[PDB]
Design a protein around this ligand. Structure first.
Ligand SMILES: Cc1cc2nc3c(=O)[nH]c(=O)nc-3n(C[C@H](O)[C@H](O)[C@H](O)COP(=O)(O)OP(=O)(O)OC[C@H]3O[C@@H](n4cnc5c(N)ncnc54)[C@H](O)[C@@H]3O)c2cc1C
Ligand SMILES: Cc1cc2nc3c(=O)[nH]c(=O)nc-3n(C[C@H](O)[C@H](O)[C@H](O)COP(=O)(O)OP(=O)(O)OC[C@H]3O[C@@H](n4cnc5c(N)ncnc54)[C@H](O)[C@@H]3O)c2cc1C
Ligand SMILES: [Mg+2]
Lengths: 299, 298
């Protein structure tokens, strides 16, 4: 049997699979290479891996995991997860292959939803980013833009971005910004454009200029976009996990949900962005809850 | 110096890593007294599973040295005192003195062991403390669980049982409760309550356990339940207030009652965790530090 089916081979699923593999549990690990950070050149902030390529990380971790004879890997798109009348969960893939598991750990991460700006996806990962703690250093002291539609995000995002560069233009892309926020930014020599963006310029995802609807053109080298995130799958929904009084689907600090034998690790947990090292840690944590839960019922 | 980081374990390393990328001025201290230095390998840290403790520490420093705003000092930190300014004064063993706006403590934890002769020679080699870290390498072996306190024995037994079923519990002269004792009898796990006289086996590799009465048993290794303590009194020199969780921490980012004082690594939960978990608590701590600075500087 499968003790735990781990859906997702990012830092979360991988580190969860590593600990569970070392704990002699039968693990089915699933990945389909739709991880959101594959659109970026490098990755930083993961100690001892500061500067590694996102596909190299994936590969090194995937191989450590496969040292352990009980962890089995499937490069397959999981499309359905269903609690049977037998208690087991049935994992089904794109190629109609079926897997039965006593436990499921969802570590599928999330996906970016972008501001209604044309051509934005080409720039995302080369010259436009979403986390300054991750990609600020490489952009430091350059003429930057912040694209932020929702107001309450803009102010915080700006103050943070200002750590890496004091040369900022905020662009709301067609949304109002309180006189409050406008005056505070402008008091820092930071201008604000409330016009909708019509165009980005610069070959191959590398920003040069931004053209607004009015016709105005400024000269930015890159910067930061605030996306909204969604889950690419509807697995939490399929399995009936309840949303909690804290806005999340998780019930303790170990990835346990409202549904017995369903667990979460990584960005699927908080439904907001973190980092590789945090996700890995949450994988380690879920592994501890899963092994603990199995131990309790079997001993 | 925006933040003095005390401790270059995975916590301090990852904290300094993020702060060096946040263009903050960092002083990072470490006196090479990490508890895990007695073990020969580390596991469970993704991409780094199997690495020597030293190699891990080396690679990290080399990585944090990449960022000009961060400078590393291999001194022992003796005193951390506040000042009339609101800053913090940091004094080392060689009496050198350091000033810094904010303080991050990531000095990990130390272990106290049960009163058994020479027990420290086997720890790291054939005696261990966490089944998640070292169970794999010990699977299906003749193991002993040394646990003086009732309240910890059962948990440690159920857990270690994942890796081997050939177990012996040794309470080292301490009483085990009737209820717990019957729970173990059912799973065929023998319990010796007699005092342990000597541990035998050369070069830190356990062979035999001899009890007070004369009984010698064959065992190849196993687990001890240590009490944990803080090596320094820094938290206490800085007057952080103990929350009702049993922790000097007010949130998930290492913040405390004492403004400008942050915590990461094993010093946070004041209980064992892992390389990868501490490391991420460094990250979280960094974020919090930069977020509180940005708030005040804007
Ligand atoms: C442009 C960019 C740059 C970044 N840079 C950094 C950085 O420098 N440092 C840093 O620490 N973080 C960075 N991040 C964020 C980092 O990538 C994430 O925080 C981290 O990957 C989250 O870990 P995770 O394991 O939760 O999710 P992921 O790593 O996203 O893993 C999710 C996995 O689930 C799999 N999956 C999803 N659905 C299915 C399905 N139906 N079937 C099978 N498999 C499925 C995907 O293949 C993916 O592998 C960056 C992100 C972006 C977008
Ligand atoms: C035998 C053993 C085996 C283990 N195996 C594993 C394993 O395989 N995988 C795993 O994930 N975890 C393992 N661990 C646990 C792991 O080592 C710890 O969980 C982790 O290192 C603690 O993180 P930390 O950074 O908070 O503390 P540490 O890494 O211990 O960092 C504390 C640092 O603070 C420094 N320090 C403290 N006070 C001062 C001072 N006054 N001045 C200067 N420097 C100071 C010390 O030099 C030390 O380097 C093991 C632990 C032990 C004991
Ligand atoms: Mg990058």
């Amino acid at each position: 049997y499968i003790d735990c089916a781990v859906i997702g081979a990012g830092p979360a699923g991988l580190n969860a699979s590593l600990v569970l593999g070392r704990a002699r549990k039968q693990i089915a690990l699933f990945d389909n290479n739709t991880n959101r950070n594959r659109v970026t050149q490098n990755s930083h902030g993961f100690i001892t891996r500061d500067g590694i390529k996102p596909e190299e990380f994936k590969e090194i971790g995937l191989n450590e995991v496969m040292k352990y004879p009980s962890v089995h890997y499937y490069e397959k798109t999981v499309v359905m997860i269903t609690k049977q009348s037998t208690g087991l969960f049935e994992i089904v893939t794109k190629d109609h292959t079926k897997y039965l598991a006593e436990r499921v750990l969802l570590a599928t991460g999330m996906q970016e939803e972008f501001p209604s700006i044309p051509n934005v996806r080409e720039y995302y990962g080369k010259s436009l980013f979403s986390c300054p703690y991750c990609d600020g250093w490489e952009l430091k002291d350059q003429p930057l833009i912040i694209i932020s539609e929702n107001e309450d995000h803009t102010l915080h995002m700006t103050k943070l971005v200002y750590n890496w560069s004091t040369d900022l233009v905020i662009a709301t892309n067609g949304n109002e910004l309180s006189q409050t926020i406008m005056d505070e930014l402008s008091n820092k020599n930071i201008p604000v454009i409330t016009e909708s963006i019509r165009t980005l310029q610069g070959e191959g995802g590398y920003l040069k200029k931004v053209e607004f609807h009015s016709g105005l053109r400024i000269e930015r080298a890159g910067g930061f976009i605030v996306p909204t995130f969604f889950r690419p799958n509807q697995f939490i929904e399929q399995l009936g996990c309840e949303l909690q009084s804290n806005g999340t689907f998780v019930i303790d600090d170990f990835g346990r949900t409202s549904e017995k034998n369903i667990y979460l690790a990584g960005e699927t947990t908080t439904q907001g962005p973190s980092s590789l090292i945090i996700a890995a840690s949450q994988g380690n944590k879920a592994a501890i809850a899963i092994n603990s839960d199995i131990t309790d019922e079997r001993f």
